[PDB]
Enzyme design. Structure first.
Site, PDB file in Angstrom:
ATOM      1  N   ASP A 538       6.595  11.314   5.209  1.00 41.13           N
ATOM      2  CA  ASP A 538       5.591  12.684   5.993  1.00 41.13           C
ATOM      3  C   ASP A 538       7.469  13.085   7.034  1.00 41.13           C
ATOM      4  OD1 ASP A 538       4.050  11.526   4.911  1.00 41.13           O
ATOM      5  OD2 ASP A 538       2.736  10.900   6.981  1.00 41.13           O
ATOM      6  N   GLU A 735      -1.841  -0.154   9.329  1.00 41.89           N
ATOM      7  CA  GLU A 735      -0.932   1.357   8.441  1.00 41.89           C
ATOM      8  C   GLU A 735       0.675   0.549   8.818  1.00 41.89           C
ATOM      9  OE1 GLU A 735      -2.277   5.404   9.435  1.00 41.89           O
ATOM     10  OE2 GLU A 735      -0.368   6.093   7.946  1.00 41.89           O
TER      11      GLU A 735
HETATM   12  C1  LIG Z   1      -1.607  14.733   7.295  1.00 43.18           C
HETATM   13  C2  LIG Z   1      -1.827  13.168   6.726  1.00 43.18           C
HETATM   14  C3  LIG Z   1      -0.837  11.789   6.467  1.00 43.18           C
HETATM   15  C4  LIG Z   1      -1.196  11.026   5.981  1.00 43.18           C
HETATM   16  N1  LIG Z   1      -0.433  10.618   4.939  1.00 43.18           N
HETATM   17  C5  LIG Z   1      -0.047   8.340   5.226  1.00 43.18           C
HETATM   18  C6  LIG Z   1      -1.710   8.154   5.049  1.00 43.18           C
HETATM   19  C7  LIG Z   1      -1.910   8.497   3.433  1.00 43.18           C
HETATM   20  O1  LIG Z   1      -1.380   9.928   2.592  1.00 43.18           O
HETATM   21  C8  LIG Z   1      -2.711   7.461   2.779  1.00 43.18           C
HETATM   22  O2  LIG Z   1      -2.546   6.320   2.264  1.00 43.18           O
HETATM   23  C9  LIG Z   1      -0.303   7.953   2.686  1.00 43.18           C
HETATM   24  O3  LIG Z   1      -0.358   8.462   0.912  1.00 43.18           O
HETATM   25  C10 LIG Z   1       1.136   8.382   3.307  1.00 43.18           C
HETATM   26  O4  LIG Z   1       1.973   8.783   2.883  1.00 43.18           O
HETATM   27  C11 LIG Z   1       1.052   7.810   4.589  1.00 43.18           C
HETATM   28  O5  LIG Z   1       1.908   8.458   5.291  1.00 43.18           O
END
Ligand SMILES: CCCCN[C@H]1C[C@](O)(CO)[C@@H](O)[C@H](O)[C@H]1O
Length: 765
Positions: A538, A735
Site C-alpha cells: 500500500d 499481519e
Molecule cells: C485499506 C485496507 C488495506 C489493507 N490491506 C492489507 C490486508 C489485505 O488487503 C488483505 O490481507 C492485503 O491484500 C494487503 O496487501 C494488506 O496490505
C-alpha cells in the site's frame, strides 16, 4: 476420467462450515440453498442479552481467542472458542459422512463448558438458526407432542432441487434446563426447547441477528400487553425465551436455554443416502477425522530442525488448520464501476485528481451474480477473497490437497471477465457487503494485483512432471487429468497476461529513454500521492509526485513470473507458436530490468520516473521493492547483481533485523513514517519469497552458495521463531511484525499468509 474426477471432487467438497465470517455455521457450495448458523450469549439481566450474543466473528477484549484445532474440508474438523465475556469455552465439531447423490450428510456437536470464573448457575441462551432460499423448496419443523415446546429432538424435514429430500435434527442435548415458577409458565411453559418457523423474502434470510431480535422483541411486547410488568417480573431468561410456534417456512429458529455446562448435536441426513446419521455416527467419524488429519500432517508437514519438537508441531497444526479452515463459499452481486472513464487511463500529470473526479460520478452498478470458493486473510476483519493474498494461501494448501487448491484456482479464474480482469477484492452478496463501508466496495477494471496464483501453478507444474486420500492427489496421479486442467485454464492465463500488457503498460517510446526492448515497461494504475493499493504494498514509498512516466520494477518482475509460467504450461500443451513469443518477452524483460531499473550507484533495483527536465531518473528506496527481481526468481545464480542484493538482504543496518527482513531500510528517509504499513514492519509473505530464493541458491553450485546458505538458515529461524513466539504469547497469527520489538501488530487471526510459516518449517523446497 477428467469428468469422473471432476464429479467426485464436486460431491466431496459440496458441504462445509463454509461461512468463515461467523463463529459456526454451514452452507453447501450452491448460491441459493440451506444455511445454518449458531448463536449464544449469557443472560444475567433484562438488557444484557443484546450485548452478549455472539454470531459474526470479532476480536476485542471480551474474546480470548478461537480457531480450528484440526480441519480438512473433505472430512470436517474441530473448532475451539474461548469467550471471556460469556464465561464459556465452546467446542464445535463438524463431520461429513459421504453418501447418496446430493453431496452426502453431516453432523455437528456443540459443547459449552463454563470457565472457572463464570457463576456455576449462569444461564446461557443458545440458538441454532436455519434458513433456505430457492423458489420451489420446502422446510418444515415437525411439531412437538408437548404444549409449549420440545422435551426431545427437533426435526426439520425439507426438500429442494439441489439437495433432494433431507432431515435436519437438533438433539435434546445434555445439560440442566432452568424452570420458571412464574405465572407466565401457564401460557409459555416452565422452560423448554422452542422453535419459531417464519418466512421472509429470500434476500434478507442472511440477516439472522435482526430476524431473531425482531422475534424476541415481539415476545417482550406480548408480555407488556398481557400485564406482565415490573411489579412481579418473569426471570430474564424466560423473558427472552421465544413462544413455541413450529411450522413451515424459509426460516426456523431453534432456541435452548441451559444452566451450567451444555452440549447438543445437529444431524443432517441426506435422504438419498443410507440410513439417517446418528450421534454415535458423529462420535465415530470425529475420532476418525483426527486420526487421518494426524497422519497426513506428519507426512506433508514434516517439521525439520530445529523445529522438530512438539511445541512447534502444535503451532504448525494451529497455523495450518486456521488457514485451511478459513475457506468460504460466497455468492451474490458485486459493485463494479464499468464506465471505463478516460480519466482512469492516467495519462496526464496530476491524474489522481482526474480519477477522483470520475469516481465521484458514481457510475458503479451491481452485477453478477458471482460465486467464489476461496480461503481468506482474517475471519474477523477480512472475511472475503483477495487476489494476491490467495496465491500465498494456496501454497501450503496445495501441499496438503493439490485438488482442493486447483479447485480454488478454477473458482478464481471463472470470475475473469472478457478483457482478462479479475477484481482484486471479491465482495459478493449483501451479507459480504454488510461488513464493508460503501466507499470501499466498488471495484475498478483498471486495477491489477500481483499474480501470485501463478506461483501455485508453478508448484503444480513441477509436481506433475515429477478415497479422500486418492481424490486429494488425483490431478498429479492421473497425468491426463492434470493436463486437461491446464488446457482449460491456459487461455485464461494468457488472457490475463495480455490484459496486464494492455492496461498496466509503461511508457518508453515517448521519452528520452534508452533500453534493449521498446515494449517491456510497466506502471501500476491506481496510485494516489500517498498510496499504491494495487501493487499490494500500500504505502511503500514510490516516486513523488506520481507521474505518467513512472515505471515499477515490482510490476515488471510479476510479468517475468507470468511469462515463465506460460512457457512451462505452453510447452506441456505443445503451443509452440506461443512458447516462442513468451521466450522473447522473457529475454526482453531480463534486459530491460537491467537497463531501466538497475542502480549501479546504489547496488539494487529501483522504480523510475521522469524529471522536471523530462529525463529518466531512478528513485531508490531500499526495501522489499529493491529485491523484487530476486524474490520473483528471475536472477541467474551467478549474477553479480544477485551478489549485491545478498549484501543488502544481509545488512543489519539496512533490511536485516533479528525478527526478519524489514519492508523498508532503516536508512531510507521514509522509514517509520506515515501509517508505517510497508515502511519498516516485517511481513511473512515477502520474507517467504526471500527464504525460498535463498534456499534455491543455497543448493546449487555457484559463487554465492554459502552466503545464501548462511542467510537461509538464519532467516528461516528468525521468521519461524518470531511468529511462534507471538502465537505462544497471544494465541494469534498477526499481519505483520515489529522489527524493533518482535511484537505482532495490526490485524489478528491473520491466517492469512502468515501461515506460510508451516511451509518454511517443513523446508525441502
Ligand atoms: C485499506 C485496507 C488495506 C489493507 N490491506 C492489507 C490486508 C489485505 O488487503 C488483505 O490481507 C492485503 O491484500 C494487503 O496487501 C494488506 O496490505
Amino acid at each position: 476420467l477428467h469428468s469422473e474426477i471432476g464429479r467426485l471432487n464436486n460431491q466431496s467438497l459440496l458441504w462445509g462450515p463454509y461461512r468463515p465470517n461467523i463463529y459456526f455455521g454451514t452452507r453447501p457450495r450452491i448460491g441459493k440453498s440451506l444455511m445454518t448458523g449458531l448463536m449464544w450469549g449469557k443472560i444475567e439481566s433484562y438488557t444484557d442479552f443484546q450485548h452478549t450474543v455472539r454470531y459474526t466473528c470479532e476480536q476485542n477484549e471480551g474474546m480470548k481467542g478461537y480457531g480450528w484445532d484440526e480441519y480438512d474440508p473433505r472430512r470436517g474438523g474441530i473448532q475451539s472458542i474461548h469467550d471471556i465475556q460469556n464465561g464459556l469455552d465452546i467446542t464445535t465439531s463438524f463431520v461429513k459422512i459421504p453418501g447418496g447423490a446430493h453431496g452426502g450428510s453431516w453432523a455437528a456437536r456443540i459443547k459449552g463448558t463454563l470457565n472457572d470464573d463464570a457463576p456455576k448457575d449462569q444461564k446461557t441462551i443458545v440458538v441454532f438458526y436455519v434458513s433456505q432460499e430457492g423458489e420451489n423448496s420446502e422446510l418444515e419443523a415437525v411439531p412437538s407432542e408437548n404444549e409449549f415446546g420440545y422435551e426431545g429432538d427437533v426435526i426439520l424435514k425439507g426438500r429442494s432441487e439441489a439437495l433432494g429430500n433431507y432431515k435436519l435434527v437438533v438433539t435434546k442435548g445434555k445439560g440442566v434446563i432452568p424452570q420458571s415458577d412464574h405465572d407466565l409458565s401457564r401460557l409459555r411453559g416452565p422452560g423448554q426447547t422452542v422453535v419459531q418457523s417464519l418466512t421472509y423474502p429470500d434476500e434478507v434470510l442472511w440477516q439472522a441477528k435482526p430476524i431473531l431480535f425482531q422475534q424476541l422483541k415481539a415476545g417482550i411486547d406480548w408480555l407488556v400487553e398481557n400485564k406482565y410488568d415490573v411489579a412481579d417480573p418473569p426471570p430474564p431468561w424466560q423473558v427472552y425465551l421465544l413462544a413455541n410456534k413450529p411450522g413451515s417456512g424459509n426460516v426456523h429458529i431453534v432456541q435452548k436455554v441451559f444452566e451450567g455446562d451444555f452440549e447438543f448435536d445437529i444431524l443432517f441426513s441426506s435422504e438419498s443416502a443410507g440410513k439417517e446419521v446418528t450421534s454415535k455416527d458423529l462420535e465415530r467419524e470425529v475420532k476418525q477425522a483426527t486420526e487421518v488429519f494426524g497422519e497426513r500432517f506428519a507426512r506433508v508437514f514434516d517439521l525439520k530442525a530445529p523445529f522438530q519438537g512438539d511445541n512447534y508441531k502444535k503451532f504448525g497444526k494451529s497455523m495450518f488448520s486456521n488457514l485451511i479452515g478459513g475457506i468460504g463459499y460466497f455468492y451474490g452481486h458485486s459493485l463494479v464501476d464499468r464506465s471505463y472513464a478516460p480519466e482512469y487511463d492516467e495519462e496526464n500529470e496530476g491524474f489522481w485528481e482526474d480519477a477522483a473526479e470520475a469516481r465521484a460520478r458514481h457510475q458503479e452498478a451491481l452485477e453478477g451474480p458471482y460465486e467464489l470458493f476461496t480461503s481468506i486473510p482474517s475471519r474477523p476483519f477480512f472475511p472475503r477473497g483477495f487476489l494476491w493474498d490467495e496465491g500465498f494461501h494456496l501454497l501450503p494448501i496445495a501441499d496438503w490437497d493439490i485438488d482442493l487448491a486447483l479447485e480454488i484456482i478454477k473458482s478464481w479464474y471463472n470470475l475473469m471477465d472478457e478483457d482478462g480482469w479479475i477484481a482484486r477484492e471479491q465482495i459478493l452478496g449483501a451479507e459480504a457487503r454488510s461488513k464493508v463501508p460503501k466507499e470501499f466496495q466498488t471495484q475498478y477494471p483498471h486495477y491489477a494485483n500481483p499474480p501470485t496464483l501463478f506461483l501455485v501453478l508453478d508448484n503444480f507444474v513441477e509436481r506433475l512432471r515429477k478415497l479422500d486420500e486418492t481424490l486429494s492427489t488425483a490431478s498429479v496421479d492421473n497425468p491426463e487429468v492434470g493436463l486437461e486442467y491446464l488446457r482449460r485454464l491456459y487461455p485464461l492465463l494468457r488472457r490475463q497476461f495480455d490484459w496486464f500488457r494492455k492496461t498496466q503498460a509503461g511508457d518508453i517510446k515517448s521519452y528520452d529513454r534508452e533500453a534493449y526492448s521498446t515494449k517491456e515497461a510497466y506502471r501500476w494504475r491506481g496510485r494516489t500521492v500517498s498510496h499504491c493499493l494495487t501493487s499490494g504494498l500500500d504505502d511503500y514509498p514510490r516516486p513523488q509526485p506520481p507521474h505518467p512516466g513512472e515505471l515499477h520494477v515490482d510490476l515488471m518482475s510479476w510479468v517475468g513470473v507470468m511469462v515463465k509460467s506460460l512457457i512451462s504450461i505452453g510447452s506441456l500443451l505443445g503451443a509452440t507458436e506461443d512458447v516462442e513469443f513468451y521466450t522473447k518477452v522473457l529475454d526482453a524483460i531480463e534486459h530491460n530490468l537491467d537497463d531501466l531499473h538497475w542502480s549501479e550507484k546504489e547496488g539494487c533495483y529501483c522504480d523510475a520516473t521522469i524529471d522536471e527536465f523530462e529525463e529518466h531518473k531512478l528513485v531508490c528506496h531500499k526495501g522489499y521493492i529493491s529485491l523484487f527481481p530476486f524474490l520473483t526468481g528471475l536472477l541467474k545464480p551467478d549474477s553479480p547483481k544477485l551478489g549485491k542484493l545478498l549484501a543488502l538482504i544481509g545488512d543489519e543496518s539496512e533490511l536485516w533485523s533479528p525478527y526478519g527482513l524489514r519492508s523498508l531500510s532503516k536508512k531510507d528517509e521514509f522509514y517509520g513514517t506515515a501509517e508505517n504499513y510497508w515502511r519498516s514492519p516485517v511481513w511473512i509473505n515477502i520474507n517467504y519469497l526471500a527464504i525460498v530464493q535463498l534456499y534455491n541458491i543455497a543448493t546449487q553450485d555457484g559463487p554465492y552458495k554459502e552466503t545464501a546458505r548462511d542467510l537461509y538458515t538464519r532467516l528461516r529461524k528468525n521468521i519461524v521463531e518470531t511468529v511462534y513466539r507471538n502465537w505462544e504469547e497471544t494465541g494469534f497469527a498477526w499481519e505483520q511484525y515489529n522489527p524493533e520489538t518482535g511484537k505482532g501488530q495490526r490485524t489478528q487471526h491473520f491466517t492469512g499468509w502468515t501461515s506460510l510459516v508451516v511451509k518454511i518449517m517443513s523446508g525441502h523446497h
